[PDB]
RNA sequence: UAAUACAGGGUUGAACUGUGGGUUAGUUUCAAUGCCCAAGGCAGAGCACUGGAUUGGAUACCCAGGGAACUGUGCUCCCAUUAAUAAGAAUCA
RNA sequence: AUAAGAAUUAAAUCUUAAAAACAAUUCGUUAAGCAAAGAAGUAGAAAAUAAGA
RNA sequence: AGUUCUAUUGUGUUAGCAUGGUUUCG
């Protein structure tokens, strides 16, 4: 009988794309360089394909060992099997860069070469002329 | 969930209090009645696509500036020929264009918007909370 | 924390930006300066792109920027007079000019319409320029009054493509001389690499828009619910 | 609805309304000649109108208040730039 | 200070002025030192 | 009583750290509160945490 | 001190990676490079000022990138300001 | 200077106590509704 | 020299706000514009002075910041209520609840009684 | 004198309903003169401070300018026929201190007494020292 | 920058006190390194200098060695001389 | 001479050498002079320094 | 603001000590 009488809309139950902490605005180029370092350290896997490197390694090992490959190439075979099972249905990511995503949140500070775009007016203006008399 | 500053002071809103709103209604009613008592007068209504699809995005007032040298030019310059009252719902967005407009402007906005951009009171003539 | 044995006091904005957590401009002090407002006049700066000034209210083939080297000027100045004594027996010798904009749908990136307009202009001895694309067309046409009227009628009624809107503007009559000498076309001559770069930038902008559009649509759905 | 509160629920107190409460008397604190708010009648200087406040300690009216009010009202009446006059009291119960 | 600091910077004082700071090339002070 | 506040001028000056490689304070230390500083309550809005010691005596 | 790791039912490469992580988070290589050569006090002042200004920015951007990755992975939508006076009542 | 006499709000409060309730603003719900109805009737 | 260092001087601009009626009356009187049809109605219903009413907004100290802390410290279980509802941030360092939360109602009633003229502790009881 | 030169700052505030200034009997007398001249809405005396409730008109404040004449490091006195010339053709208020109290330059001119020039309110651009 | 000894300053409270202050030369306590003087004198490192390279060439950058300087109630304040762009009052919740 | 150590962009000077007490690496023990690595957010009071390009 | 006391001292001078780079000894 007794129970919650309002919607479970808490942003913890329903995580939302937002920055929960603010920070003094950062120079645009400094923030861009930091984000580049983060991306390099993460090694965004946008390669030809995750399975391409495993296949190349397997083929190279087979070429190196034409006779005893059955026993030599087992770690490579297992790695390639795992890669096929995991990233077989792999699609390259299609999303905006974190730099643009944070420019959206206005994290960075306007420098001489970076300014936030002014609010759109032509696209957002909606006019409705109606008669008002009598 | 929050890791930001916690304000300690709250600002009141006298412009949008009960009695001030009642006075706004009383003063705007007389002007609207007098305007409607005269014939062949049209009223323009401006808003935002996100607060109104069906509404046309182009009208006679719109100028549609296209050149860089014309950036400073207003887009509602010619509205005075056609209209005798501009009912605005996005004063913050249209402030630069409603500034010193030669037709009366009735603006609808929130106390938060008024306090964050008090300069809209220099482009609004009549206010309806 | 570390012990640096003192602090530094740089004066320049560059070194301060490097050596401080942030150099974000703070709100003006209410006791010193007034608050910034949307009505403040913009800075008086000429709009430039890659060092070139973009100062023209209309595109036209006769738009040029002043360069650093002398260009031969006309030795003298003489403006031919405007003949105002024109009657039915002479009103056909007057010249004129207009500009047109068409919106709709055309195929082959406007090549068909370009060819049609070039043929019509060659037949009518009109001059000026035209510019056709997938969804729009613009042009500036000059010539005899009858030829201009025929061109206007052709554009309004005799175009073999979807023409949702037609507009004519900047009409003038009784001109002594014609600015142009041929009716040419403005053709997009960008390299494929340039086109690809521009398309990538446009796609970035489109994704930025789509994020907010999806958020707004979800909000509208919730409001409807 | 069972245990929680709602705005429509009768008795719902508005915290902002409670917080923004003001003392009515403090609306006339800036009304005096010397600024000590001791004069029997206090006149505020406003554009286009006159404002007179009775400021006797007990709310009683005496000759000092009579003379002050008379002079203030005559000046305001004669003044054409003051289109109307307002009369009120600064007391609590009177 | 403008012309005075200019003389200091160009080094006329370094040559012509005694210094209780001494140095192997600058003129020295043979009297007890005090701020002037 | 109506008495004006006293001046915020204090003898000695402001903290100075000796130039060079010593790290010694030529005057005052790093915990010095300038006279022109906000209140302690203003600077420390939260106040003592729940795990701080109520009595600071050692 | 010296970090000790036991290579048991794990890869020596993995254990070496864990040791490298310990060294990096303890700044061992940084201190070794610092002590290998003489650093003048003014250089140390400038370096410490630069680090104290820089690292908080890096931490904030790391948090931002973590949030971005989480939102992309979970297909989260951009938030809208919570409109007050919403009854927040169940439609039941 | 601590024996001078200057008018003070503490002195005024002490005098009154020898001899302050805050009030919330009214909402004018009915008047607001009537004015809104009149505006809607005008805009019909 | 300097620029915007003249506080109480040329840093601010003391210029009048001219509304539609004032500007149109001036234009008509000087004859730069033909009398519009709406001008009579606007004059007979002049716009109000919004700047004067704006100057009446006063900053208020938030006593709830401390009252909520007191009530929460006395009764920690109040944070369960509406724990899943967006708006109630109960994380350490915030304790910011919605106006319809029991904590907000409690502090509102306490402050109402205090305004009526009771002590903090009496209002709490 | 120092307190009056300080109160100049509190009087020259903009976009403010009221502002505080240091207390002094000379400040109280100058405020009395200002209120009698209708330049402030009012003022209140609270211990060490005085709260001046300022007056506005059409957005802008009534007090548009204050020029200090007599500073605590330099007195300025004038004979009647010098005061007349210095205040010639001006609608501003020049505050004068005399043996008859703190009055306006017009009262001083009618009385023909020697006075000390303290402040000039809304005097435009008219000063000599 | 552990403890201990001797002294400040800052913060908080109670009491006392009662315009007792803000600024400061014909004023003088302190103050990086270097230089002069005195001390010691080979933990480290290190001018001049030596010799092993690069360079048309280097009197340098690189390498090896190195008796100048590196701890003082002394002499002593030159400076990109020390918490900033002098100190105090007023305006802000 | 030579190798090894060391160093270098690469080399060289330099040290040891033929079974090793101190060239270099590993392990113990004292000895000497020397002494901010680790522990403090220039951040959050509304607290804000300089009309313009 | 100043004087006295009160709780606290990464402040300045201090006899000695724990630890440590380096060199040293086998």
TrEMBL record, chain B:
Superkingdom, taxonomy of origin: Eukaryota
Protein's name in the database: Uncharacterized protein
UniProtKB/TrEMBL annotation, chain C:
UniProt keyword terms in alphabetical order: Coiled coil
Domain Acylphosphatase-like: start-end pairs: 97-187
Taxonomic superkingdom: Eukaryota
PROSITE patterns: ACYLPHOSPHATASE_3
Coiled coil: 194-225
Stored InterPro entries: Acylphosphatase-like_dom (IPR001792)
Name this protein carries in UniProt: Acylphosphatase-like domain-containing protein
Organism: Toxoplasma gondii (strain ATCC 50853 / GT1)
UniProtKB/TrEMBL annotation, chain D:
Superkingdom of the source species: Eukaryota
Protein known as: Enoyl-CoA hydratase/isomerase family protein
Record organism: Toxoplasma gondii
Lineage: Eukaryota, Sar, Alveolata, Apicomplexa, Conoidasida
TrEMBL record, chain H:
Protein name, UniProt field: Putative 30S ribosomal protein S5
Organism name: Toxoplasma gondii
Organism classification: Eukaryota, Sar, Alveolata, Apicomplexa, Conoidasida
């Amino acid at each position: 009988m007794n129970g919650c009488s309002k919607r479970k809309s808490h942003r913890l139950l329903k995580p939302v794309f937002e920055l929960q902490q603010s920070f003094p605005k950062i120079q645009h180029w400094q923030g861009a360089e930091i984000l580049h370092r983060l991306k390099q350290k993460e090694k965004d896997a946008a390669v030809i394909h995750p399975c391409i490197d495993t296949w190349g390694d397997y083929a190279q090992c087979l070429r190196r060992y034409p006779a005893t490959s059955a026993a030599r190439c087992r770690v490579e075979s297992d790695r390639h099997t795992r890669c096929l099972q995991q990233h077989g249905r792999w699609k390259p990511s299609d999303s905006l860069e974190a730099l643009k995503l944070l420019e959206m949140f206005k994290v960075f500070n306007e420098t001489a070469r970076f300014k936030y775009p002014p609010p759109p007016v032509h696209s957002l203006v909606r006019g409705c002329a109606f008669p008002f008399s009598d | 969930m929050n890791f930001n500053r916690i304000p300690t002071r709250l600002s009141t809103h006298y412009v949008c209090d009960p009695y001030t709103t009642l006075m706004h209604y009383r003063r705007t009613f007389k002007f609207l009645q007098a305007l409607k008592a005269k014939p062949n007068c049209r009223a323009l209504c401006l808003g935002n696509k996100n607060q109104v699809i069906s509404w046309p995005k182009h009208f006679d007032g719109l100028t549609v500036v296209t050149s860089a040298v014309a950036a400073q030019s207003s887009i509602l310059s010619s509205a005075s020929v056609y209209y005798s009252l501009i009912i605005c719902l996005d004063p913050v967005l249209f402030a630069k264009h409603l500034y010193r407009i030669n037709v009366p402007v009735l603006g609808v906005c929130t106390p938060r918007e008024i306090h964050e951009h008090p300069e809209i009171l220099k482009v609004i003539d009549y206010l309806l909370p | 924390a570390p012990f640096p044995r003192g602090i530094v006091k740089p004066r320049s904005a560059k070194v301060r930006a490097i050596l401080n957590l942030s150099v974000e401009q703070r709100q003006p002090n209410p006791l010193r300066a007034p608050r910034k407002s949307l009505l403040d006049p913009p800075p008086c700066v000429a709009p430039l792109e890659k060092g070139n000034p973009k100062l023209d209210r209309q595109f036209d083939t006769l738009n040029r920027s002043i360069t650093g080297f002398r260009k031969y000027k006309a030795p003298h100045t003489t403006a031919p007079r405007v003949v105002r004594d024109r009657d039915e027996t002479n009103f056909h010798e007057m010249l004129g000019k207009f500009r047109f904009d068409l919106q709709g749908s055309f195929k082959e990136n406007g090549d068909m319409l370009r060819d049609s307009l070039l043929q019509v202009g060659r037949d009518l001895f009109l001059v000026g320029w035209v510019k056709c694309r997938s969804r729009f067309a613009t042009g500036h046409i000059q010539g005899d009054v009858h030829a201009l009227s025929y061109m206007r009628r052709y554009l309004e009624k005799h175009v073999d493509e979807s023409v949702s809107s037609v507009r004519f503007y900047e009409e003038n009559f009784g001109m002594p001389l014609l600015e142009y000498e041929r009716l040419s076309a403005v053709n997009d001559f960008r390299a494929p690499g340039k086109k690809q770069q521009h398309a990538l930038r446009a796609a970035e902008k489109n994704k930025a828009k789509k994020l907010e559009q999806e958020s707004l649509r979800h909000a509208q759905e919730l409001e409807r619910f | 609805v069972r245990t929680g509160f709602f705005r429509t629920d009768p008795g719902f107190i508005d915290p902002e309304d409670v917080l923004f409460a003001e003392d009515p008397v403090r609306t006339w604190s800036h009304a005096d000649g010397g600024g000590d708010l001791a004069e029997e009648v206090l006149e505020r200087s406003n554009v286009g109108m006159g404002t007179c406040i009775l400021n006797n300690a007990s709310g009683v009216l005496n000759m000092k208040g009579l003379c002050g009010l008379f002079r203030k009202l005559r000046d305001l009446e004669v003044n054409p730039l003051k289109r109307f006059v307002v009369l009120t009291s600064r007391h609590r119960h009177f | 200070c403008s012309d005075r600091k200019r003389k200091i910077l160009n080094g006329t004082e370094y040559i012509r002025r005694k210094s209780s700071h001494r140095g192997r090339i600058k003129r020295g002070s043979q009297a007890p030192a005090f701020k002037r | 009583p109506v008495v004006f506040p006293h001046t915020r001028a204090r003898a000695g000056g402001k903290p100075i750290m000796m130039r060079g490689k010593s790290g010694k304070w030529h005057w005052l230390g790093p915990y010095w509160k300038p006279p022109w500083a906000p209140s302690n309550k203003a600077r420390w809005p939260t106040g003592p945490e729940e795990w701080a010691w109520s009595d600071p005596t050692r | 001190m010296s970090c000790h790791r036991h290579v048991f039912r794990a890869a020596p490469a993995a254990v070496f990676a864990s040791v490298q992580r310990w060294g990096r988070r303890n700044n061992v290589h940084k201190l070794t490079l610092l002590v290998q050569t003489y650093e003048k006090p003014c250089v140390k002042r400038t370096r410490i000022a630069e680090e104290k200004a820089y690292y908080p920015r890096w931490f904030y951007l790391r948090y931002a990138t973590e949030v971005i990755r989480y939102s992309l992975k979970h297909h989260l939508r951009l938030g809208q300001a919570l409109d007050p006076n919403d009854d927040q009542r169940l439609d039941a | 200077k601590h024996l001078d006499h200057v008018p003070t709000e503490r002195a005024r409060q002490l005098a009154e106590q020898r001899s302050r309730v805050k009030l919330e603003k009214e909402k004018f719900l009915r008047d607001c509704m009537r004015e809104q109805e009149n505006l809607a009737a005008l805009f019909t | 020299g300097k620029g915007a260092v003249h506080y109480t001087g040329t840093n601010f601009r003391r210029v009048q706000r001219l509304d539609i009626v004032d500007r149109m009356r001036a234009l008509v009187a000087q004859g730069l514009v033909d009398a519009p049809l709406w001008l009579s109605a606007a004059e007979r219903a002049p716009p109000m002075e919004l700047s004067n009413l704006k100057l009446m907004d006063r900053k208020v100290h938030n006593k709830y910041l401390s009252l909520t802390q007191a009530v929460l410290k006395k009764y920690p279980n109040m944070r369960f209520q509406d724990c899943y509802v967006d708006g109630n941030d109960w994380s350490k360092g915030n304790d910011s609840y919605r106006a319809d939360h029991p904590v907000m109602q409690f502090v509102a009633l306490q402050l109402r009684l205090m305004n009526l003229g009771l002590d903090r502790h009496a209002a709490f009881r | 004198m120092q307190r009056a030169c300080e109160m100049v700052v509190s009087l020259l505030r903009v976009d403010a309903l009221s502002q505080r200034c240091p207390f002094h009997v000379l400040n109280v007398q100058i405020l009395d003169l200002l209120q009698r001249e209708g330049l402030i809405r009012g003022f209140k005396v609270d211990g060490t401070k005085i709260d001046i409730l300022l007056k506005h008109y059409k957005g802008a404040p009534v007090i548009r300018n204050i020029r200090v004449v007599s500073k605590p490091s330099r007195d300025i006195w004038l004979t009647p026929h010098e005061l007349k010339f210095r205040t010639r053709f001006n609608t501003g208020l020049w505050i004068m201190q005399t043996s008859c109290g703190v009055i306006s330059h017009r009262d001083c001119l009618r009385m023909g007494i020697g006075g000390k020039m303290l402040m000039a309110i809304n005097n435009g651009y008219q000063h000599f020292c």
